[PDB]
Write an enzyme that holds these catalytic residues in place. Structure first.
Site, PDB file in Angstrom:
ATOM      1  N   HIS A   1       0.667  -1.288   0.148  1.00 24.87           N
ATOM      2  CA  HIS A   1       0.124   0.053   0.092  1.00 24.87           C
ATOM      3  C   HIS A   1       0.817   1.224   0.032  1.00 24.87           C
ATOM      4  O   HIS A   1       2.085   1.427   0.393  1.00 24.87           O
ATOM      5  CB  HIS A   1      -1.094  -0.036   1.184  1.00 24.87           C
ATOM      6  CG  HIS A   1      -0.376   0.521   2.451  1.00 24.87           C
ATOM      7  ND1 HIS A   1       0.484  -0.082   3.072  1.00 24.87           N
ATOM      8  CD2 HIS A   1      -1.151   1.286   3.439  1.00 24.87           C
ATOM      9  CE1 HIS A   1       0.934   0.496   4.148  1.00 24.87           C
ATOM     10  NE2 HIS A   1      -0.449   1.415   4.403  1.00 24.87           N
TER      11      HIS A   1
ATOM     12  N   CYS B   1       3.994   5.673   5.729  1.00 23.60           N
ATOM     13  CA  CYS B   1       4.054   4.375   6.545  1.00 23.60           C
ATOM     14  C   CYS B   1       5.481   3.894   6.515  1.00 23.60           C
ATOM     15  O   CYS B   1       6.196   4.130   5.413  1.00 23.60           O
ATOM     16  CB  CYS B   1       3.275   3.320   6.176  1.00 23.60           C
ATOM     17  SG  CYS B   1       2.554   2.105   7.438  1.00 23.60           S
TER      18      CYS B   1
ATOM     19  N   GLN C   1      -7.312  -3.088   9.728  1.00 26.80           N
ATOM     20  CA  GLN C   1      -8.418  -2.060  10.060  1.00 26.80           C
ATOM     21  C   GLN C   1      -9.649  -2.463   8.726  1.00 26.80           C
ATOM     22  O   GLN C   1      -8.911  -2.749   7.675  1.00 26.80           O
ATOM     23  CB  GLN C   1      -8.024  -0.483   9.788  1.00 26.80           C
ATOM     24  CG  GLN C   1      -7.208  -0.137  11.002  1.00 26.80           C
ATOM     25  CD  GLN C   1      -6.665   1.254  10.813  1.00 26.80           C
ATOM     26  OE1 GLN C   1      -6.484   2.284  11.554  1.00 26.80           O
ATOM     27  NE2 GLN C   1      -6.065   1.916   9.668  1.00 26.80           N
TER      28      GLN C   1
ATOM     29  N   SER D   1      -6.149   5.291   9.851  1.00 30.70           N
ATOM     30  CA  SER D   1      -4.916   5.795   9.504  1.00 30.70           C
ATOM     31  C   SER D   1      -4.704   6.793   8.566  1.00 30.70           C
ATOM     32  O   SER D   1      -3.706   7.551   8.573  1.00 30.70           O
ATOM     33  CB  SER D   1      -4.144   4.627   8.870  1.00 30.70           C
ATOM     34  OG  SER D   1      -4.090   3.603  10.076  1.00 30.70           O
TER      35      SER D   1
ATOM     36  N   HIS E   1      -5.451   5.348   1.728  1.00 34.03           N
ATOM     37  CA  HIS E   1      -4.562   4.344   0.832  1.00 34.03           C
ATOM     38  C   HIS E   1      -4.928   4.011  -0.685  1.00 34.03           C
ATOM     39  O   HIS E   1      -6.147   4.083  -0.927  1.00 34.03           O
ATOM     40  CB  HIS E   1      -4.692   3.061   1.713  1.00 34.03           C
ATOM     41  CG  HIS E   1      -4.869   2.743   3.244  1.00 34.03           C
ATOM     42  ND1 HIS E   1      -3.407   2.461   3.744  1.00 34.03           N
ATOM     43  CD2 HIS E   1      -5.749   3.343   3.920  1.00 34.03           C
ATOM     44  CE1 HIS E   1      -3.910   2.521   5.217  1.00 34.03           C
ATOM     45  NE2 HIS E   1      -5.086   2.942   5.538  1.00 34.03           N
TER      46      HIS E   1
END
Lengths: 5, 145
Positions: B41, B95, B113, B136, B139
């Protein structure tokens, strides 16, 4: 931690 | 149609296309579950992200709207072939998995998630999501296995 539940 | 697909019509052209409301993918062709999947991702965090900080930027201040514009731009470059997913993940993912070209390794249901999980499992091998929203951030997900 990202993106764990 | 496979899990999550609907027929739609291009607002700019009138031609039929297909949209998946689980992965947010959209495509022109009529679309063609596993126990584990492997995904990479690219995450773009925003000011409302659970943890608005990353290796890229200590205080992430961009709005969710700005994050979505960035994601949409990366999707464009990936789809056009101007850039590789792996290259953009390495450079721009908020990330630490950026350091592995976005690769998260393999996982099953019950770990990620939920919107990320559902998208990941609804992708076909080799397929890429549209923007997927979690706590978060936003994505782009690539299913590799």
């Amino acid at each position: 931690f990202t993106x764990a539940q | 149609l496979p899990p999550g697909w609907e027929k739609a019509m291009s607002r700019s052209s009138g031609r039929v296309y297909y949209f998946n409301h689980i992965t947010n993918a959209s495509q022109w062709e009529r679309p063609s579950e596993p126990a584990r999947v492997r995904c990479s991702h690219l995450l773009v965090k925003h000011s409302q992200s659970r943890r608005p900080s990353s290796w890229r930027q200590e205080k992430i201040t961009r709005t969710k709207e700005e994050a979505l514009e960035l994601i949409n731009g990366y999707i464009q470059k990936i789809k056009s072939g101007e850039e590789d997913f792996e290259s953009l993940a390495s450079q721009f993912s908020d990330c630490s998995s950026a350091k592995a070209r976005g690769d998260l390794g393999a996982f099953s249901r019950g770990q990620m998630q939920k919107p990320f999980e559902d998208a990941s499992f609804a992708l076909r091998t080799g397929e890429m999501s549209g923007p997927v929203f979690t706590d978060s951030g936003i994505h782009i997900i690539l299913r590799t296995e």
